[PDB]
Amino acid sequence: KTIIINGVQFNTDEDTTILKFARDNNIDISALCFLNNCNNDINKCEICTVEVEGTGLVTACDTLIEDGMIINTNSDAVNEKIKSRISQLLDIHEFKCGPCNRRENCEFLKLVIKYKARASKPFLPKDKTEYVDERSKSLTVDRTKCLLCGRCVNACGKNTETYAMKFLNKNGKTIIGAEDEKCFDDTNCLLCGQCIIACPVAALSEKSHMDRVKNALNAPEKHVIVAMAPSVRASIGELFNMGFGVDVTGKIYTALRQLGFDKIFDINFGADMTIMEEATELVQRIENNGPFPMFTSCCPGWVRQAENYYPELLNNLSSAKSPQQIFGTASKTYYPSISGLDPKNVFTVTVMPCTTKKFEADRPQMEKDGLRDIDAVITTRELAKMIKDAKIPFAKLEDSEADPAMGEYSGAGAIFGATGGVMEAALRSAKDFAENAELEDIEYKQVRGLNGIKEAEVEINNNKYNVAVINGASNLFKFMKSGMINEKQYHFIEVMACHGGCVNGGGQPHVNPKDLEKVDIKKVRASVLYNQDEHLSKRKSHENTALVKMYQNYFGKPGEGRAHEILHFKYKKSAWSHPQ
């Protein structure tokens, strides 16, 4: 194939699009609706317009290169077309970046600047309430910003296969939203937030908990605990121009103290408690020859997927609470017992890479004696904004430590945030538990990485067991619908709704599509966690000294008695009824 682009000749055997070939050869072509290898088929943005001699204007993102093509990417006709499309988008866009939560990393703003585009008539809605949906516990929609690019719809389809995000006809007007314009929570939506991650603008956002947090911090009698997820320390530095794959654990602890939090703990401590309980439950099932398989229960997007599509599996979920909720439960029971705090005055905040965790924390029954396990959940993005609003020089902060009593963590907890991390961590303990041993070989590399469905055979007390790691909600559907769950007897299955694990959660920093082709974000974020595991002295959850003290002095033996009564949560399918 001989191709000429802007007067430059190329000879290639590639079968690809103009857009992909140009970018591979360092020729600039803009794009908007193209992402995840698809564009908006029914309302093409045409920001990728180029001129093909003899054909006319074409969309580079979905036109294959062909021998004999002469292409111009930067002619007057091309730039006029692109400018006109951006101007038409501005006609339906509330262009007020000052107070906008994407002001610092908005893809639309970059295009507006690049093409010097302007609205024909500014869009200045007086009553935004009709454009905004804040009913959800996890997601919010601001349609004054929506470009109808379809990236959320395509991303939902690709990442979850639920198609919970849809194009809708709202009284003759095209919008995106949930089925029948319902609250997302009331549909089959997983609340995973992958649609947010795909959005180029501030149209999709997380449900804010920042007022909950600030009110608690400012309340004189509230003792505000904060604890961050495994993935936050591998990610948040991106929002302070520190690059990708930077471990910023110690700076986070310092920043949270400067924000006024009263105690600095860590969800990785909760990850070690989840393993304590779940590895014990696994050994119990092994000893009772069932029931099998046991599924993890720590990802609430997967729990929603089971509730909404596979309710027959709810009884197979581990009853261990997730790290967030198990930590929260202990923060209202154990922590008062070692601090003197009145439990009613403890206010527990988590920082998580996840929108779904807000829904999980707000589940009616996630409480005891009138005290919520978790009172507020802020995303990685929300914490970044609080740090910047406080004018805290994050990149320059010195490292501090967490408060140890609920802040120490093992290497097993540290890797929870990557796909296969829970599996690996759980096996390190279940194997020791079952064989009553302190095994030296603890690295389960077979369950790691970005393969969508991963299986391994493991030997526990000279018996072979089958495990699987399901990496992304679409892969859960593939595993079940294809009958793979029936090709062998599985005994323990990890499921995460977000491909890559929580490092790719719906509350994480947005990454520019061009940056995404330069950096493998899922692997680079995950690398921070595996590195911590490698360099930590304790690499099994049951070797966490602060956790052992907790169980010895307060909860007793895991998996039974007090621990089971307090630290577990069972999901139940609805009983048969007619009509459905």
CB nearer to ligand FES: pick between 31 and 397: 31
**405 makes contact with Cl ion (CB under 5 A):** yes
* C-alpha neighbours within 13 Å on the C-beta side of residue 153: 21
Q: How far is the CB of 306 from ligand SF4 (least distance, A)?
A: 12
State yes or no: 189 annotated in a binding site.
yes
**Paired tokens of 87:** 């101007």
**Paired tokens of 79:** 């730039």
State whether residue 557 is helix, strand or coil.
coil
Residue 405 binding: pick among Cl ion, ligand FES, Mg ion, none (C-beta 5-8 Å cut-off by kind): Cl ion
Residue 272 binding: pick among Cl ion, ligand FES, Mg ion, none (C-beta 5-8 Å cut-off by kind): none
**354 makes contact with ligand SF4 (CB under 6 A):** yes
Q: How far is the CB of 73 from ligand FES (least distance, A)?
A: 13
State yes or no: 38 annotated in a binding site.
no
State yes or no: 149 annotated in a binding site.
yes
**Paired tokens of 93:** 């866009």
**Paired tokens of 573:** 């399918």
* C-alpha neighbours within 13 Å on the C-beta side of residue 565: 7
State yes or no: 100 annotated in a binding site.
yes
**58 makes contact with Mg ion (CB under 5 A):** no
CB nearer to Mg ion: pick between 71 and 216: 216
Q: Which amino acid, 414?
A: A
Q: Give CA–CA dist 416/388, Å, rounded.
A: 28
State whether residue 397 is helix, strand or coil.
coil
**217 makes contact with Mg ion (CB under 5 A):** yes
CB nearer to ligand SF4: pick between 149 and 275: 149
Long-range pairs for 128-136: beta carbons < 8 A, 24 or more residues apart: 128/94, 133/177, 133/183, 134/207, 135/183, 135/184, 135/185, 136/183, 136/184, 136/185, 136/191, 136/207, 136/359
Number of residues that bind ligand SF4 (CB under 6 A): 55
CB nearer to ligand SF4: pick between 19 and 192: 192
State whether residue 193 is helix, strand or coil.
coil
Q: How far is the CB of 514 from ligand 402 (least distance, A)?
A: 26
Q: Give CA–CA dist 502/378, Å, rounded.
A: 14
3-state helix, strand, coil in the chain (%, to 5): 40, 15, 40
Cβ(24)–Cβ(140) below 8 Å:
no
**359 makes contact with ligand 402 (CB under 6 A):** no
For 38, which DSSP code?
B
Name the segment binding ligand FES (CB under 6 A); options: 38-46, 421-429, 503-511, 562-570: 38-46
State yes or no: 33 annotated in a binding site.
yes
State yes or no: 298 annotated in a binding site.
no
**Paired tokens of 223:** 């003792």
Name the segment binding Mg ion (CB under 5 A); options: 34-42, 238-246, 343-351, 527-535: 34-42
Cβ(181)–Cβ(134) below 8 Å:
no
Tally of CB atoms within 10 A around 267: 31
Q: How far is the CB of 363 from Cl ion (least distance, A)?
A: 4
**98 makes contact with Cl ion (CB under 5 A):** no
**193 makes contact with ligand 402 (CB under 6 A):** no
Q: Which of 22, 78, 203, 378 binds ligand SF4 (CB under 6 A)?
A: 203
Q: Which of 3, 176, 402, 414 binds ligand SF4 (CB under 6 A)?
A: 176
Q: Which of 47, 48, 89, 106 binds ligand SF4 (CB under 6 A)?
A: 106
Q: Which of 17, 59, 254, 356 binds ligand FES (CB under 6 A)?
A: 59
**422 makes contact with ligand 402 (CB under 6 A):** yes
| Radius of gyration of the CA atoms of the chain, in A | 25
For 500, which DSSP code?
T
Q: Give CA–CA dist 132/369, Å, rounded.
A: 35
Cβ(80)–Cβ(101) below 8 Å:
no
Q: Which of 196, 275, 386, 502 binds ligand 402 (CB under 6 A)?
A: 502
Name the residues that contact ligand 402, by CB under 6 A. 229-231, 267-268, 270-271, 298-299, 322-324, 352-354, 357, 416-417, 422, 502, 505
Name the residues that contact ligand SF4, by CB under 6 A. 93, 95-97, 100, 102-103, 106, 108-109, 139, 145-152, 155-156, 159-160, 162, 164-165, 176, 184, 189-195, 198-204, 299-301, 353-354, 356-357, 496-498, 501-502, 505
